[model samples]
Target: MRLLAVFVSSRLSPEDPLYARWVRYGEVLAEEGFGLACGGYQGGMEALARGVKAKGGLVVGVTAPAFFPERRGPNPFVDLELPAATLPQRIGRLLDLGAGYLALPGGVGTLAELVLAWNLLYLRRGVGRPLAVDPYWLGLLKAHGEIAPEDVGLLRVVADEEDLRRFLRSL
Candidate 1:
């Protein structure tokens, strides 16, 4: 069973539009028979987890136990809690679980996952399944100053939900 992996900031609040948006998408994914996967943190992550579980769908919270040893690990909504000792493993787990990916507004950690997934798509001749990763066709580029932005095609902004879904469908 493939899932639509969602990425967002741990710092996002429930009131954040991004959080509410993914929450509704969670319901949409559940109704459509797709499960949900995420880093399983607070804010946006929790919102998605809650969303899927509310609809009685499968949801997994990939936990970096060492990173949150003092904490409770997965949130209450997580149906299953899987532990990864490192952040990289957690990211890989998220990638493995989601057949498609959706990235909303986020900060540094979100950027890391986004970029690595992008590299996987570019490097593996699409074996990495970033066609789905590009569910946003959202780009990550230019590690350094060697290439000009225009020449490198550093970014592809999605204009609207139709554009976002169109990108995913094209994959």
Candidate 2:
């Protein structure tokens, strides 16, 4: 299945508008013939994963021993749980598993994942799928002049679910 790996902060409130947006995206993912690949936790992760599960779609979670306090697997929503011994290993799996990427509002960890994915594309990874950034961060990516202008073109600025669907339809 073509998976949309969600890179989001573990800190979003399910009640927040942004979190709701993620949930909505999850529903769309299911209905549009896409599966979800996530970090496998509650909050932002659960908001999306649960939404996908609610629709009878596939949800894959990446589990790392270090991320869990009990060294247990992810929550019940994940249909397939992938185990990684380290953070880098986990991120690599995420990149490899998802055919595309979507970054939700997040903190350090989320940003780290996105940047690493970006670097992989920058370094000429064979599957250089574009990163679909939230519209809120479209200008944020443009602000970074570190890369060439053409590099900035690599980011897809999705304004909403419809915009994302249009982008996904071709993939």
State which candidate has the highest lDDT: 2
Q: Quote the positional error of residue 15 for candidate 1 in Å.
A: 2.2
Off by over 4 Å in 2: 70-72, 143-145
- Candidate 2: which pairs clash? none
Count clashing residue pairs in model 2: 0
Whole-model lDDT values for every prediction: 0.69, 0.81
Separately for all candidates shown, the number of backbone clashes (residues 3 or more apart, or on different chains) is 2, 0
lDDT of 1 by residue, 41-88 (tens): 687888877778888889888878788777777788888888888888
Please tell me which predicted candidate would have the highest TM-score against the true structure: 2
TM-score of 2: 0.89
Off by over 4 Å in 1: 131-171
